[PDB]
Amino acid sequence: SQSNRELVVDFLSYKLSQKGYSAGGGGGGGGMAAVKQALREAGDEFELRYRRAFSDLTSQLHITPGTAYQSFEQVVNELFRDGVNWGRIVAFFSFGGALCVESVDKEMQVLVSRIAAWMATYLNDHLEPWIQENGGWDTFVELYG
């Protein structure tokens, strides 16, 4: 669903903007303004909390011009290996943002667009099914937002 794609572009932009960088922002364009906000906030606390499992994980996969989508999907699978939930859902995004920020550091913003697509796909072929069977996103905001 295009809706999801909007969240990715928005979340990614917010993550990049936090490090000074910039990109095609999405905090107002489409709809689901509440979802975007609730997500951004949820992402912040994500990194903050949790001592281990975060700084090392990001290193597990180093997105590269040669890297394939299959290599990125494997990292995501591990995240949702013991089921799926709003808690882990945020991880998916927080993980993508980190990759984008890294690509920029190595003068590879072009990769950013790629990560965005890779996320949109997995989002509509793994979590999408679950999200629909959990009160959609509206619930994520009602509980966490």
Ligand X SMILES: CC(C)(CSc1ccccc1)Nc1ccc(S(=O)(=O)NC(=O)c2ccc(N3CCN(Cc4ccccc4-c4ccccc4)CC3)cc2)cc1[N+](=O)[O-]
Interface residue list for ligand X (CB under 6 A): 42, 45-46, 49-50, 53-54, 57, 75, 78-79, 85-88, 90-91, 95, 144
Exposure letters 59-74 (e unless 16+ CB within 10 A, then b): eebebeeeeeeeebee
In the numeric block, which tokens belong to residue 138? 């509206």
| Shorter beta-carbon distance to ligand X: residue 53 or 133 | 53
| Shorter beta-carbon distance to ligand X: residue 49 or 70 | 49
Nearest distance from residue 35's CB to ligand X, in Å? 12
Nearest distance from residue 24's CB to ligand X, in Å? 25
Nearest distance from residue 92's CB to ligand X, in Å? 9
Q: Which residue has the tokens 């690509």?
A: 103
Nearest distance from residue 44's CB to ligand X, in Å? 9
| Shorter beta-carbon distance to ligand X: residue 24 or 125 | 125
In the numeric block, which tokens belong to residue 75? 């990292």
What is the C-alpha separation between 33 and 145, in angstroms, rounded? Answer: 11
What is the C-alpha separation between 48 and 99, in angstroms, rounded? Answer: 17
| Shorter beta-carbon distance to ligand X: residue 77 or 132 | 77
Q: Residue 2's closest CA among 32, 27, 23, 25?
A: 32
Q: Residue 142's closest CA among 96, 83, 77, 86?
A: 86
| Shorter beta-carbon distance to ligand X: residue 45 or 142 | 45
Nearest distance from residue 36's CB to ligand X, in Å? 14
